[PDB]
């Protein structure tokens, strides 16, 4: 099967772009990530940074993630992120998105040997 590491970057990676490449992206890549395949998935982030400075993340701030367990790490810099949210007109097979980009400071949770980034918990 797809590794938990692995998961994680088809869901939240996209190193290709720097930002929110246009009013379309977010229609483009929850399609083409699979994310759109059983259902709508209703929301989701894709992070633009390179796969090593993610992966750092799990050496830096320790903090509670959302479900109680304390494998969550907060990033010290803020990272180029877009946010993909369900519209109102979206019904299944037919999905569709709204994009929104900003710079904010991301929390993952880690797991593994090697410790790595395996879900997203957070933007702050």
Do not use: W
């Amino acid at each position: 099967k797809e590794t938990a590491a692995a998961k994680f970057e088809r869901q939240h990676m996209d190193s290709s772009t720097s930002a929110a490449s246009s009013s379309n992206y977010c229609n483009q890549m929850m399609k083409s990530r699979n994310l759109t395949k059983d259902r709508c998935k209703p929301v989701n982030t894709f992070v633009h940074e390179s796969l090593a400075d993610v992966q750092a993340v799990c050496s830096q701030k320790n903090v509670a993630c959302k479900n109680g367990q304390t494998n969550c790490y907060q990033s010290y810099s803020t990272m180029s992120i877009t946010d993909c949210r369900e519209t109102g007109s979206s019904k299944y097979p037919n999905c569709a998105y709204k994009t929104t980009q900003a710079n904010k400071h991301i929390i993952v949770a880690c797991e593994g040997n090697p410790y790595v980034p395996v879900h997203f918990d957070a933007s702050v």
